[PDB]
Amino acid sequence: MFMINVLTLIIPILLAVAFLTLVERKVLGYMQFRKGPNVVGPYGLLQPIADAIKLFIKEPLRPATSSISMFILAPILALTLALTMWIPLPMPYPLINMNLGVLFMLAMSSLAVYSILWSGWASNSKYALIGALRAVAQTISYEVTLAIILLSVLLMNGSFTLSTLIITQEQVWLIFPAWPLAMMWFISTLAETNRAPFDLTEGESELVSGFNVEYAAGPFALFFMAEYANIIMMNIFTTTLFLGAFHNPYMPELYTINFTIKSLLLSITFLWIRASYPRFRYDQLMHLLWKNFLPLTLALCMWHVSLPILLSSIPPQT
Amino acid sequence: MNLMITLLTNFTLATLLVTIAFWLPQLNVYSEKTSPRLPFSMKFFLVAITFLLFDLEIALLLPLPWASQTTNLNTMLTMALLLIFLLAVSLAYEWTQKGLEWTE
Amino acid sequence: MWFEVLPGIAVMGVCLFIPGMATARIHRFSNGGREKRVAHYSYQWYLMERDRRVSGVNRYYVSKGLENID
Amino acid sequence: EMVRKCDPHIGLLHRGTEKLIEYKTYLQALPYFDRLDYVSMMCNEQAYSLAVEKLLNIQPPPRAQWIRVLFGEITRLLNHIMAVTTHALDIGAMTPFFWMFEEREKMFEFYERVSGARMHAAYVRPGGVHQDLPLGLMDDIYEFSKNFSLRIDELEEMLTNNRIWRNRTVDIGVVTAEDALNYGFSGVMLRGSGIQWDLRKTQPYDVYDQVEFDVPIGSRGDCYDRYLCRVEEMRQSIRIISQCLNKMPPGEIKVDDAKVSPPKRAEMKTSMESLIHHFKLYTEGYQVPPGATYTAIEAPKGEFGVYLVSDGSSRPYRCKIKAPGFAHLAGLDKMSKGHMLADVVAIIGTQDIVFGEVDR
Amino acid sequence: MELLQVLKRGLQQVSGHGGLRGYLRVLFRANDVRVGTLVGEDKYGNKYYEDNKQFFGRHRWVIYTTEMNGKNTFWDVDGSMVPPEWHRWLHCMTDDP
Amino acid sequence: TYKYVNLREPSMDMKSVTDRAAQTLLWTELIRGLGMTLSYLFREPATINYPFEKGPLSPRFRGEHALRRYPSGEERCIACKLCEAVCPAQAITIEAEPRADGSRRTTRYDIDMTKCIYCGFCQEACPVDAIVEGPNFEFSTETHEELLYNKEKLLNNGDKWEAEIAANIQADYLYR
Amino acid sequence: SRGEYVVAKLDDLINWARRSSLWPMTFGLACCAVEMMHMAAPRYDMDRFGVVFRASPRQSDVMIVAGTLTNKMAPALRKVYDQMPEPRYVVSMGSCANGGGYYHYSYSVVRGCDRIVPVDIYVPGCPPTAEALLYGILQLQKKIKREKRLRIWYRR
Amino acid sequence: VAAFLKNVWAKEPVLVASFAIAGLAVILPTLSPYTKYSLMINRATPYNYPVPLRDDGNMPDVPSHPQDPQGPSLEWLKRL
Numbered sequence A: 001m002f003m004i005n006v007l008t009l010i011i012p013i014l015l016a017v018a019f020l021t022l023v024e025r026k027v028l029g030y031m032q033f034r035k036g037p038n039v040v041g042p043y044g045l046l047q048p049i050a051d052a053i054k055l056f057i058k059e060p061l062r063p064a065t066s067s068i069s070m071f072i073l074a075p076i077l078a079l080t081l082a083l084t085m086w087i088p089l090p091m092p093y094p095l096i097n098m099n100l101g102v103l104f105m106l107a108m109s110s111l112a113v114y115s116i117l118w119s120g121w122a123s124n125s126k127y128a129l130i131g132a133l134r135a136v137a138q139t140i141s142y143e144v145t146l147a148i149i150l151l152s153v154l155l156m157n158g159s160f161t162l163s164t165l166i167i168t169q170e171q172v173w174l175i176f177p178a179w180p181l182a183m184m185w186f187i188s189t190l191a192e193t194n195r196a197p198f199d200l201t202e203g204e205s206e207l208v209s210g211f212n213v214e215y216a217a218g219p220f221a222l223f224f225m226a227e228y229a230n231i232i233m234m235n236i237f238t239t240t241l242f243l244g245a246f247h248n249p250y251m252p253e254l255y256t257i258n259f260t261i262k263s264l265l266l267s268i269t270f271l272w273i274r275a276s277y278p279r280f281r282y283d284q285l286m287h288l289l290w291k292n293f294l295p296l297t298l299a300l301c302m303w304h305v306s307l308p309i310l311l312s313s314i315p316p317q318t
Numbered sequence B: 001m002n003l004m005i006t007l008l009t010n011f012t013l014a015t016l017l018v019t020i021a022f023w024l025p026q027l028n029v030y031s032e033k034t035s036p037r038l039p040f041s042m043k044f045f046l047v048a049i050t051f052l053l054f055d056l057e058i059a060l061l062l063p064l065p066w067a068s069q070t071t072n073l074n075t076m077l078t079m080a081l082l083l084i085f086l087l088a089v090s091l092a093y094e095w096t097q098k099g100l101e102w103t104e
Numbered sequence C: 001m002w003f004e005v006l007p008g009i010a011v012m013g014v015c016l017f018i019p020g021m022a023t024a025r026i027h028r029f030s031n032g033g034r035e036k037r038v039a040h041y042s043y044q045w046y047l048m049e050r051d052r053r054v055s056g057v058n059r060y061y062v063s064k065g066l067e068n069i070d
Numbered sequence D: 001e002m003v004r005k006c007d008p009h010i011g012l013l014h015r016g017t018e019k020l021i022e023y024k025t026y027l028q029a030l031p032y033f034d035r036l037d038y039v040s041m042m043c044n045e046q047a048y049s050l051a052v053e054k055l056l057n058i059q060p061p062p063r064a065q066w067i068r069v070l071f072g073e074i075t076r077l078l079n080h081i082m083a084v085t086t087h088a089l090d091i092g093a094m095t096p097f098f099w100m101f102e103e104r105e106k107m108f109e110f111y112e113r114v115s116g117a118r119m120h121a122a123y124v125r126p127g128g129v130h131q132d133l134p135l136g137l138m139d140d141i142y143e144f145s146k147n148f149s150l151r152i153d154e155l156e157e158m159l160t161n162n163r164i165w166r167n168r169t170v171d172i173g174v175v176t177a178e179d180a181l182n183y184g185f186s187g188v189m190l191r192g193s194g195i196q197w198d199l200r201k202t203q204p205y206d207v208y209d210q211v212e213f214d215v216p217i218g219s220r221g222d223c224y225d226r227y228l229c230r231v232e233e234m235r236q237s238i239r240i241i242s243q244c245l246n247k248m249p250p251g252e253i254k255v256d257d258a259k260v261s262p263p264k265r266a267e268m269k270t271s272m273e274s275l276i277h278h279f280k281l282y283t284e285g286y287q288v289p290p291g292a293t294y295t296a297i298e299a300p301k302g303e304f305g306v307y308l309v310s311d312g313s314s315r316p317y318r319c320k321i322k323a324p325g326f327a328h329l330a331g332l333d334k335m336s337k338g339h340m341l342a343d344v345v346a347i348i349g350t351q352d353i354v355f356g357e358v359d360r
Numbered sequence E: 001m002e003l004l005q006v007l008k009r010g011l012q013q014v015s016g017h018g019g020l021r022g023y024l025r026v027l028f029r030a031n032d033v034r035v036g037t038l039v040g041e042d043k044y045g046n047k048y049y050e051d052n053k054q055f056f057g058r059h060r061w062v063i064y065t066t067e068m069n070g071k072n073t074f075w076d077v078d079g080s081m082v083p084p085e086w087h088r089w090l091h092c093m094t095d096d097p
Numbered sequence F: 001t002y003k004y005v006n007l008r009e010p011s012m013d014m015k016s017v018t019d020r021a022a023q024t025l026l027w028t029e030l031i032r033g034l035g036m037t038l039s040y041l042f043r044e045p046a047t048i049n050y051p052f053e054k055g056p057l058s059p060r061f062r063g064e065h066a067l068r069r070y071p072s073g074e075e076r077c078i079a080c081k082l083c084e085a086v087c088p089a090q091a092i093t094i095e096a097e098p099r100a101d102g103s104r105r106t107t108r109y110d111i112d113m114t115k116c117i118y119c120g121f122c123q124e125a126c127p128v129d130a131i132v133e134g135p136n137f138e139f140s141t142e143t144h145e146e147l148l149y150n151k152e153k154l155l156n157n158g159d160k161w162e163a164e165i166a167a168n169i170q171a172d173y174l175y176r
Numbered sequence G: 001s002r003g004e005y006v007v008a009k010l011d012d013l014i015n016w017a018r019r020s021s022l023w024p025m026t027f028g029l030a031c032c033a034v035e036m037m038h039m040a041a042p043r044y045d046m047d048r049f050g051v052v053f054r055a056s057p058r059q060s061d062v063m064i065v066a067g068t069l070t071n072k073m074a075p076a077l078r079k080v081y082d083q084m085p086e087p088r089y090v091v092s093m094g095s096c097a098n099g100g101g102y103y104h105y106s107y108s109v110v111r112g113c114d115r116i117v118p119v120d121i122y123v124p125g126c127p128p129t130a131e132a133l134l135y136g137i138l139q140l141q142k143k144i145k146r147e148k149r150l151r152i153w154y155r156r
Numbered sequence H: 001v002a003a004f005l006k007n008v009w010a011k012e013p014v015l016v017a018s019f020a021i022a023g024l025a026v027i028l029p030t031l032s033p034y035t036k037y038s039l040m041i042n043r044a045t046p047y048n049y050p051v052p053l054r055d056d057g058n059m060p061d062v063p064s065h066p067q068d069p070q071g072p073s074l075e076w077l078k079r080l
């Protein structure tokens, strides 16, 4: 009975990741004054299926790898972490109700850079490794503000428990006391998943994404679907964290409908940010972290430490 | 226990997807293709070390939502603002001595 | 026009609705028509194990009220 | 991170265009010029037409000159759309590309209505243009120009005040005015460095001394002022197109020297002299008196020159094609020093580079 | 409310193809279900439609026949299935069918 | 007769400084750009339904070549070789002899469509409207030699497309 | 029999998947790049056919050779072709990629890219219009639709 | 000090907001009248068991029953 619940978590994750590619190509189509796919299925609904079947019967590209073991383990680790980030998410009930779900998700997302690092090791090109080290330095840079913004918000929650964060936001959305934390959170999660305007691997400002370079890389579909699982998950986590919905304990479907609509709007906001801006240069998003976001994050961290003490609004532990 | 079952299930589904994505495109026999240190940067290593040290400072900051529940609140607030201030002082020394340069 | 993106958004929304609705219905099926007991703290687990021992069927979710006392 | 030396290796689209010109007549060598700066087709046509007309000692009729200036500014709108949108798409902004190529699609429809080809029209010819405007074309050019300002406005809404676009272009590719003069730069590569120079003003050709436009001048020599100069040149191209649509004269569209331009097909089939002249223009071609000219126009990429040498025959002897992208890409190595590898693609965007005219 | 007018226009598009069968027929062959004024039909079965309220480019269209010169063109429709007398009208070289 | 793009010194009073600081801290131009992208989300897209809808063309369009006839069936080409004399690609190859009734006609009329630059100089050089360049652009092949047209292919294109070619010449011959 | 039916329906499935998810790599060498960029522009819009614009060259299906192939970029063309995962197709766009074009007699131009790579669809024009290139892409899709990989596998 | 403040608010407003938020976080809990109640609420939250006292005979302030009048009260917390 529990394995049924695990599978009804993880298989609709993969189906939602499949149709996020359709939603991306359509919404980026209409924002670019064109259409997205509408030929392959009715209104494009067979495009993820056709594209997945195409990617699964396509040849392994040309080259060989430096390390077979890490070439195998990097997509395994990427997909495993991308699936385990969903199990403490209270929607309205988490699959694995743990006392430290926030800290669990922060730790498992900190583990996600090893897939990038091991895919940089496993490629033969010494330039793809440099691109991987740039990506690792980017992701570990924005994990700092993820941790401190998350701590500053949890000072109004009382615990690391994700299910308590529904109870915390019963009177107001938590974006009202913490909107600067919320906007730096949203941009930092955008910079976490290598998502535009922070996608330097998939774009220019890159020493190796330069057309007729070497570097045996993994099967693209696995890292791609791990990345879109991470995108939907970080938007659901932002929805739980700042825009927490009404929960009737006798009707859980009201909360599920409400957080689902908000998470869809927030993922479409990712789609609408990537179709609106040019890319940062690498030192420009290093600037944006280290000289812009981190001073405000430390200042608001001091503020959200000292603020429940001065307002007599310290939340309960339980 | 249910956590271990879930981790094993996620690891199994991931390994199954990886094994399919490596062995399913080997079904179609293809034409066998017969034709035909990295430079160091100090700034790349320095941003990683700056990450590590600020991450240890964050590791000090993580018990704050439990630390606000104490009865010694004046000492707690002093040491909380002092850890965030020492993180800010580490950032200011990293700023002013040209440490955040060309990866700013 | 722009309502052509709504079938894909609707399918993705149903796919996000399935996990939460699924875990709520499975928690109510596995726990006697009620919410799953949350035991974050060892007192909550102590009361839950006491319920499991007083229910007589090795199930914490079989509630015994005043009909169990004389 | 830094770029110490940037060596562009070119000739990967070198086709030996100006050797193939030497074995063809002047009318036959005209469609090579559509294919040089292939986002600037009728401007290069106009440059070669002015070179051959300067050697032939003839002039186009006034209506042909107004058609050339109208379609030269339509061509300038085409090229600055291509410039700004690919310069944004390489930096990363992908959406105004798709927005402005629908307007660029409508201007290719203008080319197809006037010539039959959407790009390589072979329309502006030595002597004038090939064929007259079809009826109702100027009304649709009016309907395009009446709305195109809003298109430039929303492009400029997406990019100009954007902090991410400005952080990629404001301190990037600074060229001093003296180095821009010394390195053979031309057009926006001069005018972004504050050099008040434009060949439509200083050395004016067909009827550019009769239209009325402003010339945008930069102040810092960077990628961002050259972006603003190209956007304001699209604004001023809309202004010139409004003046060309209002001041179009009646009359013929070829020079009425039938020893240079072909007679009409109605009189080719009726008159003996007209049939002889049609025969000898489409087989031998017109002879050009011996001499060498350097005719240069203000193309949308800069000074586009033709050093054309005639030997008295009906084929060019030498035809050197001066192009802006050659000198700009030569200056790429200076413009990228002390910058990063991401700044190099912004510098190849601010130098509007098309390798057909770089390579010939 | 003007959303009701949109839904009634959608339902009369369903009705204007002769019910759900013709609606799904044009939805899967054309990927486009809008209704138009039948300008004519050639000797192959290609049907040609107008809607001058559409923008220029959409306002004239063809529904291709299912069998032209022996080939099953139910799914294998082709741009060159249009005969030359309708090729001027469909490509808007004239206002005249 | 010139204007200065980007020669604006910003106001340094507290109102404008607070305006620019609010733009920095509250991302106002970024929300402007999001609003412009959202504005295009709710427009009707410019996408035509190819192949069921076709892009607009004029009667001057230069597509596939065709050899024409008089309204008797007699072919118009009288072998004068002006079209290969003017052909800037030398895509046209012509041989000729007097045919069996003594008429000046071609035996070879080749057009390599993969040399051809589709510039229509052959149709404007032709004194008898024989070679024209029709409206067909949907003639992609699967092999290279299917685009090396001989006289029979061009006469079949003429017989195939004459009902349209004659109407386009009828619309455009007064400009020529 | 039964196995012929099964391999026929599996050919139909994999041909549907491969033609309806074409990912093009574009050699935008010359003027035909401009017209492919119009084939991806909102009017014609290759992306609604499943044909994504600016796909990765590492995981592309069809190599659209759009421009003049010179002698100096013929080995780079062949190198990018050799780095493509099978099934790979090649659409030759325009007269210079088809047969040398306007530069056929040049000292520096490969007379058609079919001297270098195998070509599946030849799209004629200088340039062919964006509609003509989309015609060639749909003809490539029809060519994939009638492939018989598993039927010929079963009959060998 | 008014020229420097407007200059740093024109050039580096992120740092000005940073130092302003940090300075408010430092000097504000010593000025707030509710900082007393944070201490009062944390010391009134009963984590442990209230281990009772042996009634020796002289403890007039200690109640004998939870609902007795004498003892520590939380009416200030119900009302606030």
Ligand SMILES: CCCCCCCCCCCCCCCCCC(=O)OC[C@H](COP(=O)([O-])OCC[N+](C)(C)C)OC(=O)CCCCCCCCCCCCCCCCC
Pocket (backbone or CB within 6 Å): A175, A180, A182, A183, A184, A186, A187, A197, A238, A242, A273, A277, A288, A291, A292, A293, A296, D163, F024, F025, F026, F027, F030, F031, F034, H011, H012, H013, H014, H016, H017, H020, H021
């Ligand atoms: C959760 C749902 C979503 C939440 C909202 C997010 C949706 C909107 C997203 C828009 C698109 C963003 C795309 C990525 C943009 C990245 C670039 C960017 O914005 O860089 C940030 C820019 C970076 O600066 P910059 O580069 O623009 O400016 C130049 C910077 N220097 C000078 C250093 C060179 O600004 C910030 O860092 C601001 C961060 C958040 C600010 C929070 C303000 C708090 C204000 C408190 C009061 C202040 C008043 C004074 C004190 C009063 C005390 C009482």
Ligand SMILES: CCCCCCCCCCCCCCCCCC(=O)OC[C@H](COP(=O)(O)OCCN)OC(=O)CCCCCCCCCCCCCCCCC
Pocket (backbone or CB within 6 Å): A015, A041, A042, A045, A046, A049, C011, C014, C015, E074
């Ligand atoms: C949580 C929700 C998840 C939802 C996931 C799915 C989203 C999309 C839903 C489907 C939308 C409609 C799909 C229609 C596909 C095309 C059907 C069809 O008729 O195709 C025609 C094709 C050939 O037919 P033919 O015999 O040639 O017809 C000639 C007529 N004279 O005929 C064929 O090819 C044969 C029939 C094929 C039918 C395919 C139908 C779609 C299958 C998708 C797989 C998933 C199914 C759902 C699983 C989850 C729900 C239970």
Ligand SMILES: CCCCCCCCCCCCCCCCCC(=O)OC[C@H](COP(=O)(O)OCCN)OC(=O)CCCCCCCCCCCCCCCCC
Pocket (backbone or CB within 6 Å): A073, A076, A077, A080, A081, A084, A097, A098, A099, A100, A101, A104, B001, B003, B004, B007, B011, C039, C040, C041
């Ligand atoms: C390259 C190698 C392969 C890579 C892919 C696979 C590995 C990587 C992805 C898996 C990572 C596993 C992380 C699991 C532990 C996370 C922490 C944790 O257990 O938190 C949940 C919870 C804490 O909450 P709390 O409520 O306080 O405790 C329950 C008491 N009421 O605590 C509990 O519920 C406790 C439950 C019992 C203890 C669980 C122990 C799990 C098994 C041992 C570790 C397995 C992973 C080892 C490898 C890691 C990566 C190298």
Ligand SMILES: CCCCCCCCCCCCCCCCCC(=O)OC[C@H](COP(=O)(O)OCCN)OC(=O)CCCCCCCCCCCCCCCCC
Pocket (backbone or CB within 6 Å): A018, A039, A040, A046, A048, A049, A052, A053, E028, E029, E030, E075, E076, E077, G005, G006, G009, G010, G012, G013, G016, G145
């Ligand atoms: C013993 C019997 C079984 C034997 C083994 C076969 C197993 C079942 C395999 C699927 C069905 C086989 C047939 C596949 C389609 C064949 C028919 C076809 O291609 O019809 C064409 C039609 C669209 O026509 P088209 O040519 O595209 O025209 C352009 C638009 N005018 O196309 C359409 O209308 C759409 C076609 C959709 C194809 C089916 C749906 C996708 C496949 C779903 C199942 C497999 C994938 C499962 C999920 C994977 C992960 C996402």
Ligand SMILES: CCCCCCCCCCCCCCCCCC(=O)OC[C@H](COP(=O)(O)OCCN)OC(=O)CCCCCCCCCCCCCCCCC
Pocket (backbone or CB within 6 Å): A295, A296, A298, A299, B085, B088, B089, B091, B092, B095, B096, H008, H012, H015, H016, H017, H018, H019, H020, H022, H023, H026
């Ligand atoms: C007292 C409470 C506790 C205070 C400590 C806690 C602080 C929390 C925030 C953490 C900040 C971490 C980083 C700090 C670095 C400071 C040094 C610095 O940034 O100097 C450089 C800067 C000029 O920037 P530049 O180097 O040019 O940057 C490249 C782009 N131009 O130089 C400047 O812009 C000038 C910087 C100094 C002047 C800032 C004045 C702000 C005043 C705000 C109102 C008063 C607030 C109370 C605090 C006292 C401030 C004097």
Ligand SMILES: CCCCCCCCCCC1=C(C)C(=O)C(OC)=C(OC)C1=O
Pocket (backbone or CB within 6 Å): A017, A018, A021, A024, A025, A048, A051, A052, A055, A202, A221, A224, A225, G023, G052, G054, G055, G056
């Ligand atoms: C399991 C389901 C697999 C679906 C795979 C879909 C992959 C995405 C298709 C389109 C696409 C997008 C949106 C995309 O963003 C991208 O990166 C730039 C691509 O690679 C070049 C793409 O091909």
Ligand code: SF4
Pocket (backbone or CB within 6 Å): F083, F086, F087, F088, F089, F090, F091, F092, F111, F115, F116, F117, F118, F119, F120, F121, F122, F123, F133
């Ligand atoms: S269109 Fe031009 S290149 Fe083609 S055959 Fe005619 S004259 Fe020659």
Ligand code: SF4
Pocket (backbone or CB within 6 Å): F076, F077, F078, F079, F080, F081, F082, F083, F084, F094, F122, F125, F126, F127, F128, F129, F130, F131
């Ligand atoms: S110009 Fe006309 S008549 Fe003369 S050879 Fe050519 S096609 Fe024939």
Ligand code: SF4
Pocket (backbone or CB within 6 Å): D035, D038, D120, G030, G031, G032, G033, G066, G067, G068, G093, G094, G095, G096, G097, G101, G102, G125, G126, G127, G128
């Ligand atoms: S076939 Fe012609 S128009 Fe096309 S790229 Fe070549 S030269 Fe340019």
